[PDB]
Amino acid sequence: DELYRQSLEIISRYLREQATGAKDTKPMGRSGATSRKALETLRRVGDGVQRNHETAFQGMLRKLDIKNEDDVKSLSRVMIHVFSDGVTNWGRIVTLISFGAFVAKHLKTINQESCIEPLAESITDVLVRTKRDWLVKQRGWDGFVEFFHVEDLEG
Numbered sequence: 001d002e003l004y005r006q007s008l009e010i011i012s013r014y015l016r017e018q019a020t021g022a023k024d025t026k027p028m029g030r031s032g033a034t035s036r037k038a039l040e041t042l043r044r045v046g047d048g049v050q051r052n053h054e055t056a057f058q059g060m061l062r063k064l065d066i067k068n069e070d071d072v073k074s075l076s077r078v079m080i081h082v083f084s085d086g087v088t089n090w091g092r093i094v095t096l097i098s099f100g101a102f103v104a105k106h107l108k109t110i111n112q113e114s115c116i117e118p119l120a121e122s123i124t125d126v127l128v129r130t131k132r133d134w135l136v137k138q139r140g141w142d143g144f145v146e147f148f149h150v151e152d153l154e155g
């Protein structure tokens, strides 16, 4: 399952990078060039979403009351409720992943770093396993990179 593997790698790296503040130096697996550009895109676009919606992000986190492994496990049900049961577009996918990074940073601050990788698997599961058809039709991560591509300015 190339799409799942690639999705997991991108999502995991972003969540880990966000939580630790350090870049992972290990090579990407398959389709490395696209995965690199996807991660760079998430860095640009996800960071903005977290700031543009700072108050709501803090509010949702407080509402979820995330303390440990059991609470982190319960998030899949909530992701299905909120994300899967709605329209699909790249903006909503970025918000899914960006709030994931927001949760990962919370896990770091409460010294629950070990829950970050399971969280990343949970997000990947919801995204790929409920929206595969849409993702394929939109050209997957290549489509993601193309969608958010910014032209160089003249002059």
Ligand SMILES: CN1CC/C=C/[C@H](OCCN2CC(F)(F)C2)[C@@H]2CC[C@H]2CN2C[C@@]3(CCCc4cc(Cl)ccc43)COc3ccc(cc32)[C@@](O)(C(=O)NS(=O)(=O)N(C)C)CC1=O
Pocket (backbone or CB within 6 Å): 053, 055, 056, 057, 058, 059, 060, 063, 075, 078, 079, 082, 083, 086, 091, 092, 093, 095, 096, 097, 099, 100, 103, 119, 123
């Ligand atoms: C306009 N926006 C961004 C702003 C919305 C912020 C939202 O808060 C609204 C105000 N609430 C927070 C409160 F304090 F409880 C009062 C939530 C902050 C995270 C937003 C909820 N989640 C986050 C969520 C759901 C919660 C659990 C979760 C966990 C992980 Cl690890 C990752 C993602 C998620 C599913 O992913 C989302 C995808 C798309 C949208 C919203 C998603 C959205 O696509 C979406 O559908 N949001 S919404 O259902 O709440 N509604 C505003 C349309 C995001 C969107 O439209």
